Amino acid sequence: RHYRPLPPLP
């Protein structure tokens, strides 16, 4: 799948 690596929160 392409869940993508959890991005950095602001």
Place this chain on the structure above:
Amino acid sequence: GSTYVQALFDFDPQEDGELGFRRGDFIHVMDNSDPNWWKGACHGQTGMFPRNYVTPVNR
């Protein structure tokens, strides 16, 4: 309870089909089978969003 959350931080689409919302958008967790990306909705649109950009509601 209602499968939903709340974007703790406004989120933006990084790929093609990821959920798009802004802080306060209740993401309709449509598929929390992912540990960091729940396939859910927010306000009429659905897709993949980071479960962290939101928070689980209802208790």
